[PDB]
Amino acid sequence: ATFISVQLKKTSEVDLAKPLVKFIQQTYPSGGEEQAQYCRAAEELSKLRRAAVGRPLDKHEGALETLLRYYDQICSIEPKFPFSENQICLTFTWKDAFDKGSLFGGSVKLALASLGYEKSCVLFNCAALASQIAAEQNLDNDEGLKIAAKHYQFASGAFLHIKETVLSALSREPTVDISPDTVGTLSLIMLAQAQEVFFLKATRDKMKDAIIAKLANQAADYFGDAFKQCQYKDTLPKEVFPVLAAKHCIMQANAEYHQSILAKQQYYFGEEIARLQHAAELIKTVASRYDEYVNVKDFSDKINRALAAAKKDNDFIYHDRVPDLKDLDPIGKATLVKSTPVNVPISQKFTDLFEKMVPVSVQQSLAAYNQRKADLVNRSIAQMREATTLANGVLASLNLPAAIEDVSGDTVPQSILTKSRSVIEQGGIQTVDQLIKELPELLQRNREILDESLRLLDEEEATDNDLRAKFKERWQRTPSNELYKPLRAEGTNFRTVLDKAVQADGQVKECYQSHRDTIVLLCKPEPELNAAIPSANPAKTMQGSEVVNVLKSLLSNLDEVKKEREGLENDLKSVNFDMTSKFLTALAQDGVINEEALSVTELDRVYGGLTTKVQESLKKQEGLLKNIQVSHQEFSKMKQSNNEANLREEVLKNLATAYDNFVELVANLKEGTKFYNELTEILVRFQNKCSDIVFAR
């Protein structure tokens, strides 16, 4: 009972968790529940690999399932970690199963950081182990036959799968054993042996000789093709080649022998003899040439008896001419076997440790989408603010709308009064003064954090250097200096930001001292404010004039244009679409994810009404500014230039400008403060890293 089986590949143990957990934490919340399960999966995973590949080799279905499970799990991980770029480097080291090499030596090894390589080797071991479990089965027993058939077919499919994937899975050339041609040959050997098992079942079940001859002939055809492949390319262990040659002949003989019984039953006595002679010749050759590998004594006796009996009857009774072999018809062929497809899960009762984990492809698309969503939202918002800023600057330069509200040059025009009261309510000048005052204190807070952080590093390093200098033998560690270069690289960037923040401060400060006085005036109680605003004569051309009403409507509309910008900006910021589903659908429905066309399409649907309206604001303002510009210069002819009115106009213009300045200043300062406050949160984290690292030392 000699069946071919394949030996398991050897691999060196590697740390599975490490590069996995490293990535895990990089991509999730510290202490966050992710780690809680994911890191616990990557742990159980490494133990699996060791169990599936480190263990001494056990021909136990339990041991085979563990290997199958490991192939399943390993496959289930590919989408959920960024192996492709390979910045994620975990290296897999396997040895050739057969100690085969293109160059002359004993054994050839190969370490690759390609999960594709790992996958092929695991599957190979799955195939090889299955082939060993099959070769051990008791074939005089129905269960043994079922088990042997199933495993040989599994092995056949696994090997063939390896053949079809191996090269795409690998950058460089494979070790021989898993090379496409080696695994193609093994695949066919496994299939032949499965066909053999069905021939034995057929025999044991005493099926018709017609069937048995066809099953056996199909086996012959399988073993014969495998033989041919091996005939000029010796990449399998030494006993494989002779065994194939033997099994090819034995299966041919079986086919002849059963076909001869059929001939006999049809009174084709000459054919019967010719076929039994072919069978005797085949089995005779096997007995002497491959006795090292097979035992055909019982079969040889059986043939011999059938031939002697047949020659007797023919020589005395039938007198039938014995045909030449070339004149006989082919025995047909019937296959009952198929290479089993590898579709994970190939293990029983599988459960993907990382099923919850989100496919890398989708996160790459979610991140991408957000860089697009930010750009859309920020862009439109900035477009709107710059436009509003531009128009306020234009209206002030024209004394609008003050000029139209100033019917009596005696009193504070209503729009100035509204603005005054608005500012006073917002705290007045105190508001600005306070923000300005503590700007330098927020800077100082941050410098201090940064400085203390770097001092930690400096101090420890200082003792590290001393210790190495005095205790060379006893103090041998990577020098703190080396270890700290990364954190000090952060340090220098932080420092670069702070240098810029200082400049941003100096700019806002200078701009604040350049407008403080006029803002102080704006904030006076109304009578005191009126008293400081030079009076002038009015002109009745104010009451009912056309230019005034035209200008007023233009101004009212422009006002509606800028008040609308508030709701638009807020609607821009308050909405969002979670794109996870859209990406997962694309990925399950399809093989790949193209976010660009997807992002664009969803963005357009979520933000398109708004982005459109924003664009209308801008063009609408444009129209308005040209119109008021022309209408004013006309309104200008109407009014009269004297030093009194000139002086009033200068103060009104300056008062409107002071309102806009107060608005901008408060906003630029609160943006400054937020920056310093957020920078403190980051510097506090940075300071912890420095503490941690100085104390792990």
Binding site: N493, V497, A501, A504, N668, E671, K674, F675, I682
Partner: peptide
């Protein structure tokens, strides 16, 4: 053009 624009951008980059 806003004094803290660039500095605010540098911050996100890191945070």
């Amino acid at each position: 053009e806003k004094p803290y624009k660039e500095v605010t951008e540098d911050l996100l980059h890191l945070n």
